[PDB]
């Protein structure tokens, strides 16, 4: 992960201030509203007909926390994202059948969520480091597809 020291540092500091419960829920919720095609994987979560429905869905909120939790743990392994996410990559391919393109969509949504929460503090340089991290995570999740 060609991350610069000042870039690793920018990522880590901002992340220390993230409420993972809220951001996870909000990112996963937003993914489903902004890109409805993604709902194909979540049919069993209930009603996702409208934004208010999706955003309030407790299973969406809970699954967001799980996803962002695993993302969090990845941020402590930035020199070995591939190694860290290998099992998860296998599961996304072999059991869940998720097109990895959705990983990039989630990444960008997540970036919009971070900007929405941090405002001023989410500066251009800070965004840039986050775009590298999110692409990094997406690539590691796709690495074991076959």
């Amino acid at each position: 992960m060609h991350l610069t020291p000042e870039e690793k540092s920018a990522v880590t500091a901002l992340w220390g201030k993230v409420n993972v419960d809220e951001v996870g829920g909000e990112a996963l919720g937003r993914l489903l509203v902004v890109y409805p095609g993604t709902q194909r994987f979540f049919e069993s979560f209930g009603d996702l007909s409208t934004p208010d429905a999706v955003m309030g869905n407790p299973k969406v909120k809970a699954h967001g926390k799980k996803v962002l939790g695993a993302f969090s743990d990845g941020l402590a392994h930035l020199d070995n994202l591939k190694g860290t996410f290998a099992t998860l990559s296998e599961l996304h391919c072999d059991k869940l059948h998720v097109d990895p393109e959705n990983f990039r969509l989630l990444g960008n949504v997540l970036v919009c969520v971070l900007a929405h929460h941090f405002g001023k503090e989410f500066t251009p340089p800070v965004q840039a480091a986050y775009q590298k991290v999110v692409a990094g995570v997406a690539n590691a999740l796709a690495h074991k597809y076959h």
Partner: peptide, 9 residues
């Protein structure tokens, strides 16, 4: 493009 197979499990 193996990722395309995810649509034909």
């Amino acid at each position: 493009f193996p990722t395309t197979k995810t649509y034909f499990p």
